[PDB]
Design a protein around this ligand. Structure first.
Ligand SMILES: *[C@@H]1O[C@H](CO)[C@@H](O[C@@H]2O[C@H](CO)[C@@H](O[C@@H]3O[C@H](CO)[C@@H](O)[C@H](O)[C@@H]3O)[C@H](O)[C@H]2NC(C)=O)[C@H](O)[C@H]1NC(C)=O
Ligand SMILES: *[C@@H]1O[C@H](CO)[C@@H](O[C@@H]2O[C@H](CO)[C@@H](O[C@@H]3O[C@H](CO)[C@@H](O)[C@H](O)[C@@H]3O)[C@H](O)[C@H]2NC(C)=O)[C@H](O)[C@H]1NC(C)=O
Lengths: 438, 49
C-alpha cells in the first residue's frame, strides 16, 4: 500500500505517521532520526607545510676566481664575492693577499615532518546526505542506515522505505576550504603557483608524495663580513607558522544551526534543517483485519490539565464504550499537539488517559482512537521554569484557535462595531430612498 | 499523580463553631486511585487536613 509523508529533520524528534487503510485497522508508525551526516565532495588543490633552508658549505678558491653556475632548484640563489680573506682556528689560509673568491649557494626545501604535519586546500561542492533512523511499529524495533535521496530503498520487516531528497540545499562549507588536523575553515587561499611570502602558502606542493615544489620566500644573500666564513642570508619567516598563530576563528565553533564539524572524512554532523519526504510500501500482513480489532463508539474527550512547556505537559482523558478489550492506535490529526504514545490498551471500564505536548495558549485538535474520532479543546497556562536542558518536543506553533479567549473577545468587539456600522448604513439608505421615492 | 475531572461540591451540614463544624462532600471521576493535596482558596473556611 503506497503512502507518502513528510517529517522534520531534527534529531531526536518523535515523529508519528498514521496510515489509514479503509478495509483494515488504522496503523501508527514511530520514526526518529537518530543520526545524520553531511558529506561534501572534495578534490585536493595542494598541501602546505613549514620549509627548511638548505645552506651548503661555502667554496673558497685560493689564488684564483670562480664563476657562478645555475641549477634547477626551488628558490635557488647563487652568488660570488671577491676580495675575501678567510680565517680559521690556527691561521688564515688562501695565502694570496686579496685574490680570493667565495661562492654562496642556497635553496629552500620541504621540511622533514611535512608528511606528519601539514595543511590542505580543498574545493567543496554537491554535498550528499546520509542518515541513521530508528523505526518502530507493532512488535518490530530497529535502526537502519540510509542515503537521503530518491535512490535508496531499505526493507524493514517486509516494508519498503524511500527517503526522498532534502527540501533545502544549504551547506556550511563555501567553495574553498582549508583543512588542518581536526578543524575546518572558510578561507580563500591563493591559487597554485602564485603564493606570497610571509603568508599562507609560501611553499606549495601538488600532493604529499609528489617530488615537485613551488616556493617563494624572498631569500637574499649578503656579503660575508671580513675574516669569517659564514654565508649570511635573510629570509621572510615561514608563512605557515604565522597562519597557525593568527588563523582566527574556525568553523567548528561557528557553524550555524548548531551542528558539529568533524574530519577524516570532512563532514557536518547532526545539523537540523528542512523536511524529509518519505515514500512507503507496506505488505498485507502489516495491517490487522477490522473484525479482529475492538470497536469504539461514543468517544468523548476532556482535558485535565494543560501547560505549554517543553516536555509533555498536558493530560487528556477519553471516555468511550467498547465490546471487547484490546489495543487501539491513537493519533492526533494536528501538529498543534504531539502525543506521547501511539498505542493504547482499551478495557471495558471505558476510560483511558494520554499525555500530549503543545505550545499554544488555546490548542484545538482532533484525536482518533482506533476507528473513532473526537474533538479536544483546552486552555493552557505558562510554565514557571526559565531554562531546561532538553530540547522542545512540540512543533512550535503558536497561533491560537479561533474559539480561544483572546480571539473570542476580538470577534465580539468586531461584531459590535460591524452591527453599529450596518445600522448607520440602513439609516442613510432609508433616508435617501425616502428622498428618491418622493 | 491521578487525573481528576468532573468535580462537584456539596455541603452536608454547617455550624460556625470554634471546632471543625462543617462536613463537605466532593464527587469526581478518576482513572486510578492515589493521593491529592486538598486546599481552600479563601480564608473564610479553614480545612482540617
Ligand atoms: C703558492 O703561493 C703562491 C703565492 O704565495 C701562489 O702563487 C699565485 O699563483 C696564482 C695562480 O697560480 C697567481 O694568480 C695569477 O697570477 C698571474 C701571473 O701572471 C697574474 O697575472 C694574475 O693576475 C693572478 O694574480 C698569483 O699571482 C700567484 N701569487 C704571486 C705570484 O704572488 C701559488 O699558486 C701557490 N701554490 C699553488 C700550488 O697554487
Ligand atoms: C528499541 O531499541 C532501542 C535500542 O536498544 C531501545 O532503547 C533502549 O532502551 C533500553 C531500555 O530503556 C535502554 O537501556 C537502559 O538505558 C538507560 C539509559 O540511561 C540506562 O541507564 C539503563 O542502565 C539501561 O541500559 C537503552 O539504553 C536504550 N538504547 C537506546 C540506543 O536508546 C528502545 O527502547 C527499543 N524500543 C522499545 C519499544 O523497547
Amino acid at each position: 500500500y503506497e503512502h507518502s509523508t513528510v517529517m522534520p529533520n531534527v534529531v531526536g524528534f518523535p515523529y508519528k505517521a498514521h496510515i489509514e487503510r479503509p478495509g483494515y485497522s488504522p496503523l501508527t508508525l514511530q520514526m526518529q532520526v537518530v543520526e545524520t551526516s553531511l558529506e561534501p565532495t572534495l578534490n585536493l588543490e595542494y598541501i602546505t607545510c613549514e620549509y627548511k633552508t638548505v645552506v651548503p658549505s661555502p667554496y673558497v678558491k685560493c689564488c684564483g676566481a670562480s664563476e657562478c653556475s645555475t641549477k634547477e632548484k626551488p628558490d635557488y640563489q647563487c652568488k660570488v664575492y671577491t676580495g675575501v680573506y678567510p680565517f680559521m682556528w690556527g691561521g688564515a689560509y688562501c695565502f694570496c693577499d686579496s685574490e680570493n673568491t667565495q661562492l654562496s649557494e642556497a635553496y629552500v626545501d620541504r621540511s622533514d615532518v611535512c608528511r606528519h604535519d601539514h595543511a590542505s586546500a580543498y574545493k567543496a561542492h554537491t554535498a550528499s546526505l546520509k542518515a541513521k533512523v530508528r523505526v518502530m511499529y507493532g512488535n518490530v524495533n530497529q535502526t537502519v542506515d540510509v542515503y537521503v535521496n530518491g535512490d535508496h530503498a531499505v526493507t524493514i520487516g517486509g516494508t519498503q522505505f524511500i527517503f526522498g531528497p532534502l527540501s533545502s540545499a544549504w551547506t556550511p562549507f563555501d567553495n574553498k576550504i582549508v583543512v588542518y588536523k581536526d578543524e575546518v575553515f572558510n578561507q580563500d587561499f591563493p591559487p597554485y603557483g602564485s603564493g606570497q611570502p610571509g603568508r599562507f602558502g609560501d611553499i606549495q606542493s601538488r600532493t604529499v608524495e609528489s617530488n615537485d615544489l613551488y616556493a617563494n620566500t624572498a631569500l637574499k644573500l649578503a656579503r660575508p663580513s671580513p675574516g669569517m666564513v659564514h654565508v649570511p642570508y635573510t629570509q621572510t619567516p615561514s608563512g605557515f607558522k604565522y597562519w597557525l598563530k593568527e588563523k582566527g576563528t574556525a568553523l567548528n565553533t561557528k557553524a550555524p544551526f548548531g551542528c558539529q564539524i568533524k574530519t577524516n572524512p570532512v563532514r557536518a554532523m547532526n545539523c537540523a534543517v528542512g523536511n524529509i519526504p518519505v515514500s512507503m510500501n507496506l505488505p498485507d500482513s502489516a495491517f490487522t483485519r477490522i473484525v479482529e480489532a475492538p470497536t469504539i463508539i461514543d468517544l468523548t474527550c476532556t482535558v485535565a490539565t494543560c501547560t505549554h512547556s517543553s516536555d509533555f505537559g498536558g493530560v487528556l482523558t477519553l471516555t468511550y464504550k467498547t465490546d471487547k478489550n484490546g489495543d487501539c492506535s491513537v493519533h492526533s490529526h494536528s501538529n498543534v499537539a504531539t502525543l506521547q504514545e501511539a498505542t493504547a490498551k482499551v478495557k471495558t471500564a471505558g476510560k483511558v488517559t494520554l499525555h500530549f505536548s503543545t505550545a499554544s495558549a488555546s490548542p484545538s485538535f482532533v484525536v482518533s482512537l482506533c476507528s473513532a474520532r473526537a474533538t479536544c479543546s483546552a486552555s493552557c497556562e505558562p510554565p514557571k521554569d526559565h531554562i531546561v536542558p532538553y530540547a522542545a518536543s512540540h512543533s512550535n506553533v503558536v497561533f491560537p484557535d479561533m474559539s480561544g479567549t483572546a480571539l473570542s473577545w476580538v470577534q465580539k468587539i468586531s461584531g459590535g462595531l460591524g452591527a453599529f456600522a450596518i445600522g448607520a448604513i440602513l439609516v442613510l439608505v432609508v433616508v435617501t430612498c425616502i428622498g428618491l421615492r418622493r
